[PDB]
């Protein structure tokens, strides 16, 4: 009942083309990357504070020295990605800002689709394609998918509308 | 292409303006140690 809400959006609002949703993704997707690159950096930078291999115990839940080496980490990344952290306090704030911010932009976006104030088309592209029938971009391609999603879906998805689309109306490619 | 005529400005300002705000602060910071 949600996957439906997804496609409906793609089909009527053309969400994926909205700059706000894009940020939404860039955040959720990059917040995952932080939540996984950090986790791995910590675990593979641990000092030895135990004798066995299962180094989970080596960590005294009680205070004292850092358990991994921020200094070593900062060195790794900086030579293997040019940039690297070096301020645990900033690292952990970034980790709060990234995923949080993106879901906020994600929201503003939808507040917009409430008024169907979507980011459906690029006029410059439409005007061109209306006049020149040989102009095709992945943009236009996707727009036809939407026409399809609405034509075939609408009927059973909006019953109170009593839609009736005769087979001859249904937009379709060739063969299929 | 029939693009928005104010696009070239909406993009130019959207870059320069806040971007300059940051350049000002940074440099004014450096100079609190005579730098620049």
């Amino acid at each position: 009942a949600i996957f439906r809400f997804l496609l409906f959006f793609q089909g009527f609002h053309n969400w994926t083309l909205n700059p706000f949703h894009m940020m939404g993704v860039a955040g959720v997707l990059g917040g995952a990357l932080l939540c996984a690159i950090h986790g791995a950096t910590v675990e593979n930078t641990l000092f030895q504070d135990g004798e066995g291999a299962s180094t989970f115990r080596a960590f005294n839940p009680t205070q004292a020295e850092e358990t991994y080496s921020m200094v070593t980490a900062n060195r790794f990344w900086s030579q293997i990605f040019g940039i690297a952290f070096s301020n645990k306090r900033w690292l952990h704030f970034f980790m709060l800002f990234v995923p949080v911010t993106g879901l906020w932009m994600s929201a503003i976006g939808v507040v917009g689709l409430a008024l169907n104030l979507r980011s459906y088309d690029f006029i410059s592209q439409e005007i061109r394609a209306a006049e020149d029938p040989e102009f095709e971009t992945f943009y236009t391609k996707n727009l036809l998918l939407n026409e399809g999603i609405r034509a075939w879906m609408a009927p059973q998805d909006q019953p109170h509308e009593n839609f009736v689309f005769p087979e001859e109306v249904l937009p379709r490619g060739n063969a299929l | 292409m029939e693009v928005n005529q104010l696009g070239l400005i909406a993009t130019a300002l959207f870059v320069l303006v806040p971007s300059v705000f940051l350049i000002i602060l940074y440099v004014q910071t450096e100079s609190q140690q005579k730098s620049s």
């Binding site: 040019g82 | 292409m1 696009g7």
Partner: peptide, 30 residues
């Protein structure tokens, strides 16, 4: 005119990459 505007902001991200790497404030041990 757009092409140019897109290629510029891009050329800027790329020069900003150089500086952020090879012109940062070295993380000195304190």
């Amino acid at each position: 005119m757009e092409t140019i505007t897109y290629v510029f902001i891009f050329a800027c991200i790329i020069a900003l990459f150089f500086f952020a790497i090879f012109f940062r404030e070295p993380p000195r041990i304190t």
